Amino acid sequence: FITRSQAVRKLQVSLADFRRLCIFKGIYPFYYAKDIQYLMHEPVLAKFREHKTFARKLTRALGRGEVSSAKRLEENRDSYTLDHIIKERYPSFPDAIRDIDDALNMLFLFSNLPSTNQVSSKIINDAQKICNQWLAYVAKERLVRKVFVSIKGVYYQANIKGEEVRWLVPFKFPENIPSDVDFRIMLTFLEFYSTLLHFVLYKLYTDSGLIYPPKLDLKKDKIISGLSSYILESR
């Protein structure tokens, strides 16, 4: 085992970024020595370093007064992808559907959020898009078993490849965001669960169902922006 301090120091990475990688990799506490010792060689850590280089090289351009080169630095920017991070976390598809329990709870909460200076509108619109894709599929292939309306929200149970997932949807009212909660921890969980859901939904649609991603009717999205909108075709 190793202490948090010893893990942070060994990685030569910030605590925030240590915790970001810990969220992505599914690492939990004393940490396991071989777990941190296995985190050290990883593409995501290298891409975090690249983001740090990009950050200063952009503020160099902005701070001087040149705007065109800064705008060009945005064009020549690649970002870290959480693709290979799931293969090593959930190697089988039934294992990923065992995690989607907790994954769909964040994502359906983040749909029912007013956008703040913490969380951009693009983040909430993409999260809501995935939510609507999930709702569309479960209503398409007819996979509901149990419902439960509580004070908290509305619970559902769904035999998704025959393993009974559970997930919670809040009521469609404005939600009072406390200043107490940390919208930097939750954003990385969203960032991991989001990509996880993209790959799950591709696997589900391309196996038994439909084309991915489906289109949405513009004048249907103008009426409801819910579930009667977003038409989806089989072949």
Partner 1 sequence: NKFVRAESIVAKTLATSREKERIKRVSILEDKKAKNETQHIASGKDFILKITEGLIREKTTYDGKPALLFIVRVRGPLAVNIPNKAFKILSLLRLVETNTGVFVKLTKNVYPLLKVIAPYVVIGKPSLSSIRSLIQKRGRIIYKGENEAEPHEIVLNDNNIVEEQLGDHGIICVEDIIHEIATMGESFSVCNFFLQPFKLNREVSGFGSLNRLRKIKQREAESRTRQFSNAATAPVIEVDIDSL
Partner 2 sequence: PYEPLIDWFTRHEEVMPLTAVPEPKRRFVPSKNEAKRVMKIVRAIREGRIIPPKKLKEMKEKEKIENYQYDLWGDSTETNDHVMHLRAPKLPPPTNEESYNPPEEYLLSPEEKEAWENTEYSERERNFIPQKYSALRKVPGYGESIRERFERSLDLYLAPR
Partner 3 sequence: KVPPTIAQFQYTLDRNTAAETFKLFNKYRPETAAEKKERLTKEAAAVAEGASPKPYAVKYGLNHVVALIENKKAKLVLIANDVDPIELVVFLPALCKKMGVPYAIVKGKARLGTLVNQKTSAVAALTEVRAEDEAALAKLVSTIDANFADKYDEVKKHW
Partner RNA sequence: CUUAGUAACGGCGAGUGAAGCGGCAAAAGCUCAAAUUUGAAAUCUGGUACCUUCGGUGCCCGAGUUGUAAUUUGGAGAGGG
Partner RNA sequence: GUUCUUUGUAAAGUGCCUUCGAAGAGUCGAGUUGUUUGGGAAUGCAGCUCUAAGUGGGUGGUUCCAUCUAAAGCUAA
* Binding footprint of RNA on the chain (CB under 7 A): 57, 60, 72-73, 76
CB of 55 to RNA, least distance (A): 12
CA distance 47 to 27: 19
CB of 47 to partner 3, least distance (A): 24
Name all contacts of 179-186 with Cβ < 8 Å and 24+ positions apart. Answer: 183/116, 183/118, 183/119, 184/16, 184/118, 185/19, 185/23, 186/106, 186/110
Closer of 9 and 64 to RNA (Cβ): 64
Q: 3-class DSSP state for residue 22?
A: helix
Closer of 81 and 208 to RNA (Cβ): 81
Strands (E), 14-72: none
10 phi/psi in degrees, rounded to 5: -65, -35
CB 197 within 8 A of CB 130: yes
Closer of 65 and 178 to RNA (Cβ): 65
Closer of 67 and 211 to partner 1 (Cβ): 67
CB of 66 to partner 3, least distance (A): 6
The binding track of 57-76 with respect to partner 3, each residue x by CB under 8 A or -, is -------xxx-xx--x----
Partner whose footprint covers residue 57, from partner 2, partner 3, RNA, none (CB < 5 to 8 Å by kind): RNA
Site residues for partner 3 per CB under 8 A = 64-66, 68-69, 72
